[PDB]
Design a binder for this molecule. Structure first.
Ligand SMILES: [Zn+2]
Ligand SMILES: [Zn+2]
Ligand SMILES: [Zn+2]
Length: 108
């Protein structure tokens, strides 16, 4: 149902060894709600339903792909579609572990 590939996956960068914090607030407004993490630079900003700071970040950086801290979906702002691919497996997994803990039935 998401796209199996997009031309912007090349811009997905290595996950920091620091890992991900799915409860990290928006870097601009500080909201705890509807945050996304940028898969290029790993700054965290809010979704369109709050103050739209991730969309603003896309506009001012050109960074393509972002991961939702709500449902762990990856969205590309250029393709205007959700994407799932091997390049996104590391981040989605580390995010899932941080969000739900290790005691989960989901394949890591
Ligand atoms: Zn915000
Ligand atoms: Zn970015
Ligand atoms: Zn794309």
């Amino acid at each position: 149902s998401p796209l199996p590939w997009c031309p912007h996956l090349v811009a997905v960068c290595p996950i920091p060894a620091a890992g991900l914090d799915v409860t990290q607030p928006c870097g601009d407004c500080g909201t705890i709600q509807e945050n996304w993490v940028c898969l290029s630079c790993y700054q965290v900003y809010c979704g369109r339903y709050i103050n739209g700071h991730m969309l603003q970040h896309h506009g001012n950086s050109g960074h393509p792909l972002v991961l939702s801290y709500i449902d762990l979906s990856a969205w590309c702002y250029y393709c205007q579609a959700y994407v799932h691919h091997q390049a996104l497996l590391d981040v989605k997994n580390i995010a899932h572990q941080n969000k739900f803990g290790e005691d989960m039935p989901h394949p890591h």
